[PDB]
Design a protein around this ligand. Sequence first.
Ligand SMILES: O=C(NCCS)[C@@H]1CN(Cc2ccc(F)cc2)CCN1
Length: 370
Amino acid sequence: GSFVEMVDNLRGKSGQGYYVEMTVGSPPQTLNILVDTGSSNFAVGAAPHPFLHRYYQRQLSSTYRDLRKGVYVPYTQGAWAGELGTDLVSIPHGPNVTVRANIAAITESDKFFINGSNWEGILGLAYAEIARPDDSLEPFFDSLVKQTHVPNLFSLQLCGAGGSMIIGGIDHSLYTGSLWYTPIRREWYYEVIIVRVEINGQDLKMDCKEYNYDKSIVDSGCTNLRLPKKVFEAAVKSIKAASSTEKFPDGFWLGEQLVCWQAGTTPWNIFPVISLYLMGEVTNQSFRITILPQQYLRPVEDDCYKFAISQSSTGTVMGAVIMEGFYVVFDRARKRIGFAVSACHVHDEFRTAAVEGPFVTLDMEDCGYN
Ligand SMILES: O=C(NCCS)[C@@H]1CN(Cc2ccc(F)cc2)CCN1
């Protein structure tokens, strides 16, 4: 592909977030920006903070325009407050363009910036509907598409232990096998529909509406695979039974406790695979995406791991757990999301992550929550 200058543009430590190099203002002030497909605001630190090494200085930028309006944005994890404005933004290792975008200048925050994360801002890649204060505040990618010839598409390859955010196209060297697409249900979050869940080839036997109770979303700005109360309970009991060859403390299945082994001795074989079936583009068709323990058990600072599946009250969140196993294509132009086996995904000599289809499924439209 012609996106070789875009490959390997992502960095970020385990459980802290993946970020891209971006510049704001004139002359260009370089900052590292969290890639977040679960929000829609572009906001950078614009005042000193204990965890910030650098921040956006508006007085040093000649192209800064004050919108003279304060903004507050709460997330599931973290919140910030700031002042709205516009300025020139560029992505050094992305498309060779410069755009005027809405930037929220973060002057106040809580549980947002992470110590040692190395990022100083957030790139909300989702749609305008879920942007604060309202959908009149144009997200960065909408600005980028409207002002340049860069196509209405981006793709993410999150690599657990870097990765690539390809803006405008698809690099074929970042995946193996075929690309399977699932329809975007609504343009707010990256809402998808899960039709079936399997733990080590065993169906959870639940009404498929439970898998999407509230919503099912694709979110790079989330560490965990988060599941609705009912689905989480059913999943944990199934994972616990499949991995009964070793006993673990009850706090481990809650993220409260860690589990450790000797270096290189980690027995991945005892932990089951997890398959999420996603609605296909063709009527009565579906495809499954299968993740390994390497994805849902994440290394902690002997090799120690944290159980990276948690419970949710706001629906299914397909986080980095899911996305680190796959090359994900956010095809906005065709209202669909693509999944392919990542070339950088962590696996062993016995098992690998999989994207397989098609599968026959009757009554798919029901699976969505109303
Ligand atoms: O609410 C949020 N995500 C959903 C909960 S998992 C995000 C959390 N993010 C910090 C963060 C992002 C990515 C990551 F890998 C680890 C941490 C700040 C913005 N809001």
